[PDB]
């Protein structure tokens, strides 16, 4: 999933060309399109303007916020490249976004996807205590409550977002696309490995719990609202509660078709 | 389908309420005051709270009273559905007991009626902003319902938290929904391929419906449950995947909000 | 809980905050105006509850004085409040820290919240109870309806998506997932919503309905529709739940094992 | 002040609006919410007004219904404004737009936010009168009591420091710099503040006490002590002001002359 | 002062909230959460004030429990308090009500505010008092610096524009109007603000510089600067000032006679 | 000012910051937010003003962008800020610490704030420098207009009530006290403000008027109303003023000696 700055830079444009046409149409909305997206000359400047202002609260302002965020893409630059990617994902995934410009401006998945990066980060700087301060701020402000410690790849859609929990040793990898309530959950009161690993092209319907440290192989599809205790197959469709293998997906990488059906039989 | 009766007694009845309410809680009474004492009418009062729930500092309060205004105006039955889904929640939900405490309180009801205006946002071609709202009412009370979608009224949506509703999805009127219901879709492409939902059916919670499947009318589809095939008329579905395990003891499930399945 | 049980929780707490301070100058002033510079829990869980819940209708500084006449009221509220921080402490592994549920764990705050609405409910003060009821499921994604009669040494993690409703009851040293709802069935008063006894633990995203028992020491499953009672020490899960096991010890909050069979036939075979 | 000169402020300043956006990006949303969407005066001043006079004890979208509802009652007030616009433009040469006393100018919004409270102030609605008063002397520094009597054709430039008591009258056509006292003496209710004629132009920091008259197109000098009163159409100035000359022009106010000997 | 001629002056205000609140629906949760609903005269002073000085960087509810430390340590601040609201009752012939300075008079919250400054400054608290120092100026347009000595029965009229420096002495009874200064001169440290004895009364516009004393009674006309000391019993006036003949009574700050001649 | 000396005033605030969030715990993150994570005065400033400067209409973050490209055009107004600082410290016996202009004071504020206004102004985003200046106006009570040519070492002590119009011009190292008109005459534009040359102590209150000039180390006594040009290295007062006398230092405005004595 690796991006050629030039690649990136044409996704930037790919947007700034939509914020234009969005501008126009919407005066409404013109200067807040104009602020976030058309001041701006590449995606990490926007981004950390988009996050900023979701992220505020009075313990921590935007314009706090943005500070932080700013000096982790320092730090970072392929943050960047992953949040392009995450906005590629969508845009390919979801038939009901249309623009580039829309996860950035306005989905809290991705938002919330984004924000986790920043947590994660601050994590490995052993600044913790930022880092959870970010998480639960997360959690009620997009009601997506993901634990910094978690690794999670890029070229990832979360639709809809709410209600997803992803817990402290889970690992999602590249081109992974789960919907609205899912949880990479935990099982036990120790610390230690026990939350999931979601391999490569996965795909987990909506409302579907995936407890312990079980893996879910790639090119693998989780029913909705299935209650996965074991490790699931590779190119493997899995469903029920608990969910056993039903079947086997009807292409490679069903992240990238959002295909929901199953068997449960 | 609401008579200027029918539409001034729910009003009256909210007055009244208010006015008793001012009186018993007066660190809300200014509240009360302000959002419904002053009004004359559900449209003005509904306008009122609908912007004070959507306001952003990047759209205050005040400017999107002006673009709910203006929906109203356009179409009047927007307020009719509104006071239809009021009754319904009374009527159904036997933790309300008043009129007034859907339209001051319960987000679903908000959420609901936000849907509305996006709703005629998007007709209008003003799907931008469309888009914005829909996204600002996610966030807001987590409620994520696509602008696009043709929902009818009489709608229940109780507690709400985690309600998906997609961008082709058909309900019709008298149905109850509860938290953590999707009615979502299917595939990468465009297309209907969201679920039509049929009068009185009643959805319980966290049931996930996909794809351009029918719920037929008065069905009951059970809490938990997700289904994936078309649901006939006056049956109960149930299961992971669903299965037609029964039939509902009333017509309407919607209006009696029995959750038991065989 | 002990008078001196109490203050040692609290002790604990000012001595991480002390610490976080130093670690995070960002954060230094809102650790010292809510933790470092109150006597006690009771002040700082006011301070913390007020600011969480503030709004335009009511301001911070109002439901403060909200807050702080009910556990003036009833103390045993805060010490209820002790006992859930604790109960986070011990059960959630992800949880290292005393200071970390009060200051951000919204289930948590919304369970301290319920108890606020809770008493003025039994002080005839419903309306504001409601409002209450559903600022706190705007703001944190929890519905929790004040009349529900909730225990403590009781367990919210994540916790988006929870509801709890009117004639529910949840006894003490309860543990509770995401996306759980222990709601009512028909369009009439009266019992309707569930009664979680002692021990009880329930996965991510069960639903439990009517007026049903769940009994002392069950599990029941993530994604388990609970249409029926559950017996004591036993494990129910499935869409609808039956009995598929006994869990692993007598009060199994504690411990959080979400493992549970597809049959009981499979947990009797070993899988 | 006729329906069609009124339209044409109107559509003048909506014209400027046009123009204001497509030239700053960042505002032009502003710009658009504030008179671009609004089809009267009426309509756009409400709305500066509700924003302009915001608090959490009263919120803007609350405040607009109110002086919405003082406009249906005294439609007077909306050409009153068009008439303070209008003086502005004309009399301030820093001043270029009709938009601009509307949009930024804090002695026009003082001016328009006090015949809200007067009107308050005659439908046995003091309590809010009063509340709003003091509310505009912490938001623009300006403290205007809502029983004083006060014309159109008003200019409050820079307006900080502005002080018009209980018992005061300002007449039309009149021009009010910063830090301007119309105020009262004694301990006492009853007639007690100016009585400021037609014409007449008063200096910064001018202070006019007690219950004494400026006479049509008299002129008060900046930093003038004025404690009784002056005839129309005379130069006054000095700590206590002296009649020292007379204005050039008939009406002072016009033309923003400062000077005095 | 005594504790029922307290209890007294808290009551007409708690009665006046009744009414006001009956009145005026919009404003009835404000009368009730600022007023009605508190037991004392410090109860509500503190609430006031927090949502008065509020900013991001300190919101009211901080604000609140500082304020309260201070009325603790220190309880006749509140004293003050009571002095000062009769003081504008009695004083300003455009009030008439008691609720009405400790509502909404933006030179009567900043002079209760300075009182928090000047005893955060006393506890060696100085940044503090200097942050709300310049946080009452910004919102109120009102700077006094918290060192100043400022006493009791003081009437801050209208009070835009307002500086009183950081050696400046104000005792008991004393008025003084907007755009008022009790100023400094030099740019060294030391003694240079002026000292305003009792009863005195200050107009609109008038400068006061220096480490000079307007004595017992005096009257300062608006519009004047004031570079010598005034006796006692004088009025004085213009630019710069003379002394230009005597008040008509012993304490012009409780009459707010504006006149004085011109020679 | 050199590039060296910009350097040891910002470290003399950022070690005077360092100080001031050990005593006092409840601004400890406001001096660590605002000072301390800067590394030059530049960004604490685009940080200070930014919130100062903050409305619904263009909120903090927003505004440091505008001015963050302000100084990036031109990095002297930093060294304008710096020496502006300087001016306070040295001048006003109130302040002690570098950082008591930098954090507190609004006229210190007002001035800076005026300076990206007339950095605007030259861009020719006069829509954006009219909003600034009335922004500031209500913000602060301090009405600049951006058209204005304003140096640095400058006072404006206290600061409410100053109003200084379009065609004003105050050179560098004036003392401007409280309630300070430079104020125009007419109805016509072009030159009708005054012009303070260096070295200038204009005391509380005065109002000077028309396109006149306060020659270099000339005082204007408190209360004085000035309508004719006023000669260097001299004293005037008086409603109006006339000349009383010549100042005993040779820049008043570093003195701040208030005395008029005649």
């Given at each position: 999933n690796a991006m050629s700055s030039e690649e990136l830079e044409q996704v930037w444009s790919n947007i700034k060309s939509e914020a234009r046409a969005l501008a126009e149409c919407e005066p409404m909305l013109a200067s807040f399109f104009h602020a976030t997206?058309?001041?701006?000359?590449?995606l990490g400047s926007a981004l950390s303007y988009i996050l900023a202002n979701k992220l505020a609260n009075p313990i921590m302002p935007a314009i706090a916020i943005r500070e932080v965020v700013e000096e982790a893409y320092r730090s970072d630059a392929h943050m960047i490249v992953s949040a392009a990617r995450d906005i590629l994902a969508v845009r390919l995934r979801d038939p009901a976004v249309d623009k580039y410009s829309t996860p950035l401006l306005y989905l809290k998945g991705f938002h919330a996807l984004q924000a986790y990066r920043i947590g994660h980060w601050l994590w490995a700087q052993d600044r913790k205590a930022l880092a959870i301060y970010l998480q639960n701020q997360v959690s009620v402000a997009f009601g997506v409550d993901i634990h910094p410690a978690a690794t999670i790849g890029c070229g990832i859609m979360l639709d809809h977002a709410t209600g997803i929990v992803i817990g402290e040793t889970a690992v999602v990898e590249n081109d992974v696309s789960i919907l609205q309530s899912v949880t990479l959950g935990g099982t036990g009161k120790t610390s230690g490995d026990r939350h999931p690993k979601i391999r490569e092209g996965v795909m987990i319907g909506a409302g579907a719990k995936i407890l312990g440290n079980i893996e879910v192989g790639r090119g693998a599809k989780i029913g909705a609202g299935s209650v996965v205790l074991q490790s699931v197959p590779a190119h493997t469709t899995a469903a029920g509660?608990?969910?056993?293998?039903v079947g086997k997906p009807e292409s490679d990488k069903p992240s990238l078709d959002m295909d929901q059906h199953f068997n449960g039989s």
């Open positions: 997206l058309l001041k701006h000359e590449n509660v608990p969910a056993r293998i």
